[PDB]
Design a protein around this ligand. Structure first.
Ligand SMILES: *[C@@H]1O[C@H](CO)[C@@H](O[C@@H]2O[C@H](CO)[C@@H](O)[C@H](O)[C@H]2NC(C)=O)[C@H](O)[C@H]1NC(C)=O
Ligand SMILES: *[C@@H]1O[C@H](CO)[C@@H](O[C@@H]2O[C@H](CO)[C@@H](O)[C@H](O)[C@H]2NC(C)=O)[C@H](O)[C@H]1NC(C)=O
Ligand SMILES: *[C@@H]1O[C@H](CO)[C@@H](O[C@@H]2O[C@H](CO)[C@@H](O)[C@H](O)[C@H]2NC(C)=O)[C@H](O)[C@H]1NC(C)=O
Ligand SMILES: *[C@@H]1O[C@H](CO)[C@@H](O[C@@H]2O[C@H](CO)[C@@H](O)[C@H](O)[C@H]2NC(C)=O)[C@H](O)[C@H]1NC(C)=O
Ligand SMILES: *[C@@H]1O[C@H](CO)[C@@H](O)[C@H](O)[C@H]1NC(C)=O
Ligand SMILES: *[C@@H]1O[C@H](CO)[C@@H](O)[C@H](O)[C@H]1NC(C)=O
Ligand SMILES: *[C@@H]1O[C@H](CO)[C@@H](O)[C@H](O)[C@H]1NC(C)=O
Ligand SMILES: *[C@@H]1O[C@H](CO)[C@@H](O)[C@H](O)[C@H]1NC(C)=O
Ligand SMILES: *[C@@H]1O[C@H](CO)[C@@H](O)[C@H](O)[C@H]1NC(C)=O
Ligand SMILES: *[C@@H]1O[C@H](CO)[C@@H](O)[C@H](O)[C@H]1NC(C)=O
Ligand SMILES: *[C@@H]1O[C@H](CO)[C@@H](O)[C@H](O)[C@H]1NC(C)=O
Ligand SMILES: *[C@@H]1O[C@H](CO)[C@@H](O)[C@H](O)[C@H]1NC(C)=O
Ligand SMILES: *[C@@H]1O[C@H](CO)[C@@H](O)[C@H](O)[C@H]1NC(C)=O
Ligand SMILES: *[C@@H]1O[C@H](CO)[C@@H](O)[C@H](O)[C@H]1NC(C)=O
Ligand SMILES: *[C@@H]1O[C@H](CO)[C@@H](O)[C@H](O)[C@H]1NC(C)=O
Ligand SMILES: *[C@@H]1O[C@H](CO)[C@@H](O)[C@H](O)[C@H]1NC(C)=O
Lengths: 270, 437, 196, 286
């Protein structure tokens, strides 16, 4: 916030605004990613009170209202996963609470109505009658579900159990998201630590130069600091843009997986 | 907002325009409450000043002063100073100091620093390279001989502030203790040390009040900063005087007078955004202060910070403009409202273990998907852009080598790639086809 | 005699409080796997800086001469102690036979394993600890003294329990600061590929 | 025009209009086949019948609504003309890409006028004012500014070009699968089950007119996962079982058209007891 520095930042014109504009483009892209992954239907669906799902037991993936009303499994996810100056976090438009609502709505449609809520609004169907279609979508005949119904429910309910055990025992898969948190933390703390880099100036701290030098001298060093910090900021923003393109590919891929693999059944093998 | 976005009308939206900051109400100075004044009397009226080949020194400690006050002296003839930003004499506290004193020829008062045309410094009075000071001098008659002496040579320069005690060419000019260029000049130099530490010898300021819980600028001895001086819930080690965050920035300070451990809260920033309809549609604006509490700023509070000029509403709608943390805003019966957004309409699905619905009818839903397929096929020459192709500039641009070529080539790569993108999209038919009449 | 004392003789690098964090640093430090010489009066080189420890409670150990010449006639450093009431000087000395000029600086302040470290200008760090040949335990030493003394410290000798000696090196280190900013553990960044 | 330049496309605005006309002509007159190789001509009424089967709605449904669908299609086309006639912000992305190009170039031009600690940003001043003894220093700052600004600008252009290229691959992909084909992949052609789409060009871009089927009116029924008829269970060949409340029918998954459940539309699959919620019925045999 130093005026004496800001007087010299003005030598370099648009860059500060351009970086903020790039970061704004990124920030809009984050809400957009989130919106276009999760908000793929323009309704909340309420879960039914009766859990008459032909023996299938979503109780761990569905909300419990006593909890934010996350699922059981989502608590593992929030638990296993893990700086304040110039740098700012901004909240999502879709809070973790609203995302829990939206994932519950998605899941409520995905339980109660199959793919149909991706095309229209949800048209309900019994869950074992949905799964007999999902069998049909892997060339397995609908009767093969019912001829094993309670056993398949047991395999599923057990697999859900093994998922909880795996997720409770280790963060091994969640490393993929702890990775994004870590990349952000590394980039951000790098970006802070770079405020303490000298770049060939007599100090790294701008206030220290302003305390140490009279302005005819101080300009000569502050030009270095500004150029270095700026080059580092641009570098960082470039990492964040490239990472944002990576995350955008991930978000479009995720949105596609939601569109084809949640709201439908992608025949696209593996 | 119009000034930021450069338009005499701005569209409906939220626009960041600035960052609000809580302004520092105070600028603060503190150090331990020093109890003495700089002992110049041990040097500046001493009965003997040394021959500079064995210059005298005494420490200065426990002091608060304006270091220019030696210009008030009746006996001193001159008070020159070294070139590294000399007004900084009265800034942050000095941590160790000396007065250094001797006799020279009066022309040699300019020679009391290395790199001059000096006979005195590099073989007798050698300063360390960034050491800080001033030279104060007079003909010897203003206090108190051919026994005053300086050294002409050594095989190389001696050690910084050190005497090479040994059993050696020395000289004296027109020296008597009652006698500028050949007069014996009595000198005192003030030498100020560089070490980062708590106070010993400070400027003319004093320890002001330890103003807690206000946003303020501060200094503690020389630990300058700006923030809210909130009190900590933390214990230092007994010798630790300040502390640093996980971010390595200063998280905390001890009061340099007391075990008052203060842990700073940032002087509150808040990303300023305007929420507006199209400016053609209203000149009413609502102002968001991202992350702040409604404090030193209708008014309303969000998880995304404090909000002003929007009016709070319970009903949920599609998000006409977003604010964050589920908050959205619209201009309606008129004024800007703000609300927690709709996640769409709720729909309790009619589920059962025997319940179904089947569409009796359908809409064909002819719907636009917009996709960009090229940039503009832009191109640039580094030489024409940077230099206007002026030869005098282009010479220098070629000393930066392949940057020109690779940038011009990269954009050429893009330019070729635009017609590639275009054919990858459109040229999926190799023929052209003509529709029937 | 000798002993690998491994990990003792660490000291606090700065007045910077920190907490619960894996901070990193670079200084004249005792190299780990610290094979100290064991003594049970002699004159020794100072090298890069000295690490010293005395296991004492008879308190027959009293302090050290330091500097260049040590034994009087011209300036060299001398320290003598009892807990922390230390009396320190650089003069042309004289010595008591059986007690059981130019003072450009002078000042007044088995079971006790008392540890001390000395380095550049000059600084001293120390720690008293209880115990009941230097054992392979842990310590960190407080930066108790700062010394614009200018003595050409290149030699030293103990004045008079048992004691042990090692030498520093300029090395990179990593430190585990705790809930109160105490260094609870440390790593020598060139000790082995794991420590690196 | 100021040392910055724009090259033409090879494929100019009206060439693109012919190219999109060729795509659209193939799409109308030959369906997907002109992607594979030969543009095998096909009546458009047989083409949407194939697109119906590709959403599991059987093609008889098309012709039993033939002109009525055409009226909805033509009406929706009209509403698209209305939508675009009003809504400039429908072209948000394309106008935004153009605006980002313009912003980047205008920023690059504003940065021509930026000083970077030189005595001027008009290069000619320095050349008019100073010997190379000092002008090389001033010009070095100005070069460094303009060059960092170029590296920056070019990086934005490249990153933006990677978005454009991802978008172009996605567009090409939709032109392959959603135009020169039908995407079975839900929402890859936007909301609805997908039938067909049409290309239209725009400045530096494209529009797809996605002709998705969206289900609309619905009826409320009882259902069962199977029926018994002989203590043998029976199951639908395609679609699902329903009752209105008094009679059981099989109907197709995406449009209510009831059929009597029969041996002609079902398979036997052993005894009933394995199934939760199987119901009695009478199945007919033609
Ligand atoms: C559905 O699954 C949940 C667990 O996934 C079952 O809940 C457990 O029920 C037993 C008693 O039957 C309790 O001891 C456990 O503490 C419950 N689990 C948890 C996480 O609290 C539930 O009983 C299952 N219900 C059906 C009908 O399958
Ligand atoms: C499906 O819905 C459409 C409207 O979306 C119905 O269209 C009407 O059809 C009748 C003749 O059948 C006309 O008289 C009306 O003018 C039409 N109205 C509109 C708004 O187009 C259509 O009848 C419905 N078809 C079925 C089988 O339910
Ligand atoms: C279920 O569908 C059947 C067949 O459309 C309906 O039964 C017919 O009802 C009409 C009017 O009562 C009679 O003229 C027909 O002769 C009936 N056909 C048969 C095979 O009985 C039945 O009414 C419908 N039920 C409901 C609840 O909609
Ligand atoms: C379907 O209808 C049959 C009769 O047509 C039912 O079978 C009877 O079930 C009862 C109770 O289990 C037995 O006591 C009778 O002996 C059975 N009769 C015959 C002829 O099998 C059957 O329970 C019905 N099932 C459902 C789900 O409606
Ligand atoms: C500051 O002054 C007060 C009152 O004389 C005294 O108690 C306090 O110890 C002083 N602090 C320092 C470190 O000078
Ligand atoms: C020395 O005495 C003279 C007056 O005789 C005065 O100008 C000078 O400031 C004095 N300095 C000190 C430290 O006494
Ligand atoms: C301003 O925008 C509104 C919609 O927000 C529109 O109805 C109106 O015609 C516009 N007026 C002008 C003068 O641009
Ligand atoms: C605002 O500050 C008050 C202080 O009591 C606190 O209770 C409240 O939770 C704060 N709200 C936000 C969103 O910061
Ligand atoms: C919102 O509803 C609560 C009760 O649910 C009421 O107390 C409050 O006054 C309402 N606020 C507004 C802005 O309508
Ligand atoms: C310590 O070093 C000496 C040589 O300096 C060596 O003889 C001895 O074996 C070493 N002892 C240990 C415990 O490493
Ligand atoms: C310091 O004194 C010693 C004698 O104790 C001498 O050998 C050495 O050369 C001196 N130090 C240096 C750095 O030369
Ligand atoms: C005192 O100082 C002189 C140099 O001035 C030195 O040669 C001599 O050794 C010192 N004498 C004593 C007794 O320390
Ligand atoms: C502490 O240490 C020195 C050296 O033994 C001694 O001169 C001093 O008198 C001691 N302190 C007390 C309280 O006797
Ligand atoms: C920190 O100090 C408190 C007493 O002030 C003590 O209870 C706590 O155990 C200490 N924790 C550590 C890790 O030193
Ligand atoms: C079906 O009928 C019940 C009658 O109570 C109604 O509650 C439910 O919403 C209806 N569902 C549909 C899809 O029409
Ligand atoms: C549906 O569930 C209820 C219990 O919730 C049960 O009485 C009924 O028999 C079930 N019907 C079917 C068709 O599964």
């Amino acid at each position: 916030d130093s005026t004496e520095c800001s007087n010299l930042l003005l030598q370099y014109g648009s860059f500060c605004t351009q970086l903020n504009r790039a970061l704004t483009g990124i920030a809009v892209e984050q809400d957009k990613n989130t919106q276009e992954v999760f908000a793929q239907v323009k309704q909340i669906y309420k879960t039914p009170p009766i859990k008459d799902f032909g023996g299938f037991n979503f109780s761990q993936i569905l909300p419990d209202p006593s909890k934010s009303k996350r699922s059981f499994i989502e608590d593992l996810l929030f638990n296993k996963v893990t700086k304040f100056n110039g740098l700012t976090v901004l909240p999502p438009l879709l809070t973790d609470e609203m995302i829990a609502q939206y994932t519950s709505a998605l899941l409520a449609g995905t339980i109660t109505s199959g793919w149909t809520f991706g095309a229209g609004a949800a048209l309900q169907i019994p869950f074992a009658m949905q799964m007999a279609y999902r069998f049909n979508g892997i060339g397995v005949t609908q009767n093969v579900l019912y001829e094993n119904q309670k056993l398949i429910a047991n395999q599923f309910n057990s697999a859900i159990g093994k998922i909880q055990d795996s997720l409770s025992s280790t963060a091994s898969a969640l490393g993929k998201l702890q990775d994004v948190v870590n990349q952000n933390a590394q980039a951000l703390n790098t970006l802070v630590k770079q405020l303490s880099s000298n770049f060939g100036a007599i100090s790294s701290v701008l206030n220290d130069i302003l305390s140490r030098l009279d302005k005819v001298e101080a300009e000569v060093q502050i030009d270095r600091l500004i150029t270095g910090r700026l080059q580092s900021l641009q570098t960082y923003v470039t990492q964040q843009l490239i990472r944002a393109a990576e995350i955008r590919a991930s978000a479009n891929l995720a949105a596609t997986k939601m569109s084809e693999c949640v709201l439908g059944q992608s025949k696209r093998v593996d | 907002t119009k000034c930021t976005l450069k338009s005499f009308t701005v569209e409906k939206g939220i626009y960041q325009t600035s960052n609000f900051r809580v302004q520092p109400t105070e600028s603060i100075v503190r150090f331990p409450n020093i109890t003495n004044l700089c002992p110049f009397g041990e040097v500046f009226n001493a009965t003997r000043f040394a021959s500079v080949y064995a210059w005298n020194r005494k420490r200065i400690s426990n002091c608060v002063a304006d270091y220019s006050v030696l210009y008030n002296s009746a006996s001193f003839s001159t008070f020159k100073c070294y070139g590294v930003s000399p007004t900084k004499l009265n800034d942050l506290c000095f941590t160790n100091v000396y007065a250094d004193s001797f006799v020279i020829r009066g022309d040699e008062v300019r020679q009391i620093a290395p790199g001059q045309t000096g006979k005195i410094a590099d073989y007798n009075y050698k300063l360390p390279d960034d050491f800080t000071g001033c030279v104060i001098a007079w003909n010897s008659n203003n206090l108190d001989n051919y026994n005053y002496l300086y050294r002409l040579f050594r095989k190389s320069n001696l050690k910084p502030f050190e005497r090479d005690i040994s059993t050696f060419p020395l000289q004296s000019y027109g020296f008597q203790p009652t006698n500028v260029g050949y007069q014996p000049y009595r000198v005192v130099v003030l030498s100020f040390e560089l070490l980062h530490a708590p106070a010993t010898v400070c400027g003319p300021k004093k320890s002001t009040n330890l103003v807690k819980n206000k946003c303020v600028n501060f200094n503690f001895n020389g630990l300058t900063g700006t923030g809210v001086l909130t009190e900590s819930n933390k214990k230092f080690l007994p010798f630790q005087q300040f502390g640093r965050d996980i971010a390595d920035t200063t998280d905390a300070v001890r009061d340099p007078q007391t075990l008052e451990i203060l842990d700073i809260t940032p002087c509150s920033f808040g990303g300023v955004s305007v929420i507006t309809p199209g400016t053609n549609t209203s000149n009413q604006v609502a102002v968001l202060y991202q992350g702040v509490n409604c404090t030193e700023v209708n008014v309303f509070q969000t998880r995304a910070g404090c909000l002003i000029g929007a009016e709070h509403v319970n009903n949920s709608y599609e998000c006409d403009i977003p604010i964050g943390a589920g908050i959205c805003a619209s201009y309606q019966t008129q004024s800007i409202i703000a609300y927690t957004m709709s996640l769409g309409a709720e729909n309790s699905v009619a589920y059962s273990n025997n319940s179904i619905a089947i569409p009796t009818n359908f809409t064909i839903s002819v719907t636009t998907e917009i996709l960009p397929v090229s940039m503009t096929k832009t191109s640039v020459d580094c030489t024409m852009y940077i230099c206007g192709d002026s030869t005098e500039c282009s010479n220098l641009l070629l000393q930066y080598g392949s940057f020109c070529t690779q940038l011009n080539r990269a954009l050429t790569g893009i330019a070729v790639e635009q017609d590639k993108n275009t054919q990858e999209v459109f040229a999926q038919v190799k023929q052209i086809y003509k529709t029937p009449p | 005699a000798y002993t690998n004392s491994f990990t003792r003789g660490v000291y606090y690098p700065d007045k910077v409080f920190r907490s619960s964090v894996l901070h990193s640093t670079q200084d004249l430090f005792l190299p780990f796997f610290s094979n100290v010489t064991w003594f049970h009066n002699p004159v020794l080189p100072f090298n890069d800086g000295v690490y010293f420890a005395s296991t004492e409670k008879s308190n027959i150990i009293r302090g050290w001469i330091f500097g260049t010449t040590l034994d009087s006639k011209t300036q060299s450093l001398l320290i003598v102690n009892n807990a922390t009431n230390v009396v320190i000087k650089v003069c042309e000395f004289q010595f008591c036979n059986d007690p059981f000029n130019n003072c450009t600086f002078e000042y007044v302040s088995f079971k006790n394993l008392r540890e001390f470290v000395f380095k550049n200008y000059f600084k001293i760090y120390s720690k008293h600890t209880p115990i009941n040949d230097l054992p392979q335990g842990f310590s960190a030493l407080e930066p108790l003294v700062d010394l614009p003394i200018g003595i050409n410290i290149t030699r030293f000798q103990t004045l008079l329990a048992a004691y042990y000696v090692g030498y520093l090196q300029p090395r990179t280190f990593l430190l585990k600061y705790n809930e109160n900013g105490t260094i609870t553990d440390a790593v020598d960044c060139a000790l082995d590929p794991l420590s690196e | 025009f100021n040392g910055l330049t724009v090259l033409p496309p090879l494929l100019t605005d009206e060439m693109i209009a012919q190219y999109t006309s060729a795509l659209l002509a193939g799409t109308i007159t030959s369906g997907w086949t002109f992607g594979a190789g030969a543009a095998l001509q096909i009546p458009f009424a047989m083409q949407m019948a194939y697109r119906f089967n590709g959403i599991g709605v059987t093609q008889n449904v098309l012709y039993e609504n033939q002109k009525l669908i055409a009226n909805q299609f033509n009406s929706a086309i009209g509403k698209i003309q209305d939508s675009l006639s009003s809504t400039a912000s429908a072209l948000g992305k394309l106008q935004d890409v153009v605006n980002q190009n313009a912003q980047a170039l205008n920023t690059l031009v504003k940065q021509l006028s930026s000083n970077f600690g030189a005595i001027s940003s008009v290069l000619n001043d320095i050349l008019s004012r100073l010997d190379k003894v000092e002008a090389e220093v001033q010009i070095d700052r100005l070069i460094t500014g303009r060059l960092q600004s170029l590296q920056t600008y070019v990086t934005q252009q490249l990153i933006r070009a990677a978005e454009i290229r991802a978008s172009a691959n996605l567009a090409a992909t939709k032109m392959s699968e959603c135009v020169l084909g039908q995407s079975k992949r839900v929402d890859f052609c936007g909301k609805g089950y997908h039938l067909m789409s049409f290309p239209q060009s725009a400045p530096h871009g494209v529009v797809f007119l996605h002709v998705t089927y969206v289900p609309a009116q619905e009826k409320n029924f009882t259902t069962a996962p199977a029926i018994c008829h002989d203590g043998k269970a029976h199951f639908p060949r395609e679609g699902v079982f329903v009752s209105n409340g008094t009679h059981w029918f099989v109907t197709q998954r995406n449009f209510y058209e009831p059929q009597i459940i029969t041996t002609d539309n079902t398979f036997v699959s052993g005894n009933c007891d394995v199934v939760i919620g199987i119901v009695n019925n009478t199945v007919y045999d033609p």
